[PDB]
Structure formats: structure tokens, C-alpha cells
Nucleic acid binder design. Structure first.
Ligand SMILES: Cc1cn([C@H]2C[C@H](O)[C@@H](COP(=O)(O)OP(=O)(O)[C@@H](Cl)P(=O)(O)O)O2)c(=O)[nH]c1=O
Ligand SMILES: [Cl-]
Ligand SMILES: [Mg+2]
Ligand code: NA
Ligand code: NA
Ligand code: NA
Length: 326
DNA sequence: CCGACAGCGCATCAGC
DNA sequence: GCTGATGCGC
DNA sequence: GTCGG
């Protein structure tokens, strides 16, 4: 990437804010500014040039000059010398270990990947799976593998019922050439706004995908969200594909477009879009867009026949998925 | 010179 | 066991 | 940490 030095610096600072400081707004400030710089098709030569882009303010501007002049930030190399913070930063890379579990492990002298393996009985189920697949979960999914995973998933849900609708969202739907995980929006013509005839629909889909040994592990399970692990089959004598993370969301169809807007992202896009909706008197979640009252109460769901309908309520021009990569 | 910063699903734990 | 918070994740 | 009021 063209400005990868700057975007790497900003990402590291962002990871520090989230993993150690727990300064979630600082986290989001660095990652927003990293996002715009990464999408900027021009080689940033100074913090002043950077300060013209949205998200880049005084302090990021200053840090870009320091990095462009020295190749590093003082703040970053003091963090890399802090052994508690660096241990914490590493442990939060394991799926299921956050700042709270990380600093509890550090205080027990659990500090390295091998330490975790030696004390696996101290991990909850999620953390075990993150540890088991730690290397795999550091690997990106080439788009060609996403296509083969989409192939299995979409056919399998048709097998459990031919009217099922499955849409692979996330970065894949935005056109990314590789993705971190797989995000599947699932909906069924029989399933409208939580009208209770018979739930259990997600379990049936999960069951079938376990049956064919595509889904290999379970991180979470409820009526609307399944999170877990999956794997492409190999031909005889190829290396196994890495295990991959998978999130499947079951949503009523009348909420399908709010659902696919949410699951397509990006997370920063959703934050920006939902904030702007607040600025126009609405609130957006993965299910509905509602009007906000003068006092904060939310209204009844508004009708939606397309993603574009939601952009229209808040007076945005429609952005195609490939330009939502904020 | 300040306060806002999206909104949710699920698993686990602390205290009862 | 339940509530309610905290934790981690999307 | 940024931005908007
Ligand atoms: C983390 C996050 C995700 N989402 C929505 C929006 C988001 O697009 C969707 C999937 O979450 P994802 O973590 O899989 O993000 P992704 O775009 O797929 C890429 Cl980062 P990759 O996974 O390909 O590496 O969930 C949010 O709305 N808020 C969030 O805080
Ligand atoms: Cl913050
Ligand atoms: Mg994803
Ligand atoms: Na600016
Ligand atoms: Na993690
Ligand atoms: Na995900």
C-alpha cells in the first residue's frame, strides 16, 4: 500500500488504545484516520498534507511528521519497551482474550503463546478455540477461497430449504480481494418480524453445515447469531486449508435490508452512517430504521424495500458496497 | 471550549 | 438458579 | 483524538 508506513503507525497506536488504554474513542480516531490515508491515492509527504483529509487532526498530523522524519514515533517505542502493555497487546490477538482476560493472565505469569498452551484449563471455551486456531486466525482468506466457501454455504442452506436466502456480506460483499472472516446474512420467506410460529431456523442451518463438516467449532449460538469456525475440504494430498471464522445472522425478511446494510459494513461506515442518522432524527440498527422523538423515544419501524431506501431517509446519496470501505 | 462519539448478540461472572 | 454487570465480539 | 456546536 502507498502510505502503508503511516497507516501501520496509526493502526499500532489504535491497537494500543483499544487493547491497553481501553480508550475506544481514541481507538476509533486513529483507525478512521488510517482508513482515509490508506484510501488516499497520493503519497503523503507531511502532516499538513494529511491534515486536509477527514479524521486527521492536530495530533495525528504531528505524529505523521515525526514518523516521516524519523521512521518511528517515540510513543510507539516506549510502548514496545513496556513489558506489561506489550504482553497484553499480544494476548488480545487470541480470539476471546480481551484486555480484562489479558491483564489477568499477565498477573498469573501467563504472557506467551506457550504459556497459554500450558494453562489451557484457565481459558473459557471461546479462548480455547482462539488458541487452537491462533495461527489460522492470523491468516486472511483469499477471495477465491471465499467464493468456494460461499458455494458450500449457499447450496447447503438451500438443501435445508430451497426458499432460504443467504448473502455473504462483510468485506467480501464490498469487493475485497481477501477477508478476515465470513459473514453470512440468512433469511427465510416464512420468517417475518419475530412473529412466533417456530424459531429454531438458525440451528437447522448450523446443524446441516456441521453435518458436512464445514462448520467444525462453535463460539456462540442463539436464535439470531451463530459464531464459530469452518473449513474448506481439501483434495487428497493438498495441505489443509486454514480454519476460518464464521458469523451467521438470521434476520426476518422485512428487516433484510437493514440487516444486509449492517453486515456489509464497514464498521466505521456503520458508525458514520448511524451517527448521521442521529443527526437527521433517526436511529439505525441491524433490524430497522426508526424515527427519533424530540425526547429520545424511538418510533415504529419505517418501511424498506432496498438498501437505498435507508440512505434516502437520512438524505445520503446511495453508496455501493465497494465504496463503503471506510 | 467543550461534550458527542452506533448499536447490537451472546457468554460468563459476581453477588445474591 | 436468577439479576445485572462486565467482557468480547460483530 | 477529532469535530462540530
Ligand atoms: C466489528 C464491527 C462490525 N460491524 C459490522 C459491519 C461489518 O462489516 C460486519 C462484519 O464484521 P467484520 O469484523 O467481519 O468486518 P469486515 O467488514 O467483514 C472486515 Cl474487517 P473482514 O472481516 O473481512 O476482515 O459487521 C459493525 O457494525 N460494528 C462493528 O463494530
Ligand atoms: Cl477515548
Ligand atoms: Mg468480516
Ligand atoms: Na482535518
Ligand atoms: Na482477540
Ligand atoms: Na464477523
Amino acid at each position: 500500500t502507498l502510505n502503508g508506513g503511516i497507516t501501520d503507525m496509526l493502526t499500532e497506536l489504535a491497537n494500543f488504545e483499544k487493547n491497553v488504554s481501553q480508550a475506544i474513542h481514541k481507538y476509533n480516531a486513529y483507525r478512521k484516520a488510517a482508513s482515509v490515508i490508506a484510501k488516499y491515492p497520493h503519497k503523503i509527504k507531511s502532516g499538513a498534507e494529511a491534515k486536509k483529509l477527514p479524521g486527521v487532526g492536530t495530533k495525528i498530523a504531528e505524529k505523521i511528521d515525526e514518523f516521516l522524519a524519523t521512521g518511528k514515533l517515540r510513543k510507539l517505542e516506549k510502548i514496545r519497551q513496556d513489558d506489561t502493555s506489550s504482553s497484553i497487546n499480544f494476548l488480545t490477538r487470541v480470539s476471546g482474550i480481551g484486555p480484562s482476560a489479558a491483564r489477568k493472565f499477565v498477573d498469573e505469569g501467563i504472557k506467551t503463546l506457550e504459556d497459554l498452551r500450558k494453562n489451557e484449563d484457565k481459558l473459557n471455551h471461546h479462548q480455547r478455540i482462539g488458541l487452537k486456531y491462533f495461527g489460522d486466525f492470523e491468516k486472511r482468506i483469499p477471495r477465491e477461497e471465499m467464493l468456494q466457501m460461499q458455494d458450500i454455504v449457499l447450496n447447503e442452506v438451500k438443501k435445508v430449504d430451497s426458499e432460504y436466502i443467504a448473502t455473504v456480506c462483510g468485506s467480501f460483499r464490498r469487493g475485497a480481494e481477501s477477508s478476515g472472516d465470513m459473514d453470512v446474512l440468512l433469511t427465510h420467506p416464512s420468517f417475518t418480524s419475530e412473529s412466533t410460529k417456530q424459531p429454531k431456523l438458525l440451528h437447522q442451518v448450523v446443524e446441516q453445515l456441521q453435518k458436512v463438516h464445514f462448520i467444525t467449532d462453535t463460539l456462540s449460538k442463539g436464535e439470531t447469531k451463530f459464531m464459530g469456525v469452518c473449513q474448506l475440504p481439501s483434495k487428497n494430498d493438498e495441505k489443509e486449508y486454514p480454519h476460518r471464522r464464521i458469523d451467521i445472522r438470521l434476520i426476518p425478511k422485512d428487516q433484510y435490508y437493514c440487516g444486509v446494510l449492517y453486515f456489509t459494513g464497514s464498521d466505521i461506515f456503520n458508525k458514520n452512517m448511524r451517527a448521521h442518522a442521529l443527526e437527521k432524527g433517526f436511529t439505525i440498527n441491524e433490524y430497522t430504521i426508526r424515527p427519533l422523538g424530540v425526547t429520545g423515544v424511538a418510533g415504529e419501524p419505517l418501511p424498506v424495500d432496498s438498501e437505498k431506501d435507508i440512505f434516502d431517509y437520512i438524505q445520503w446519496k446511495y453508496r455501493e458496497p465497494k465504496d463503503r470501505s471506510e
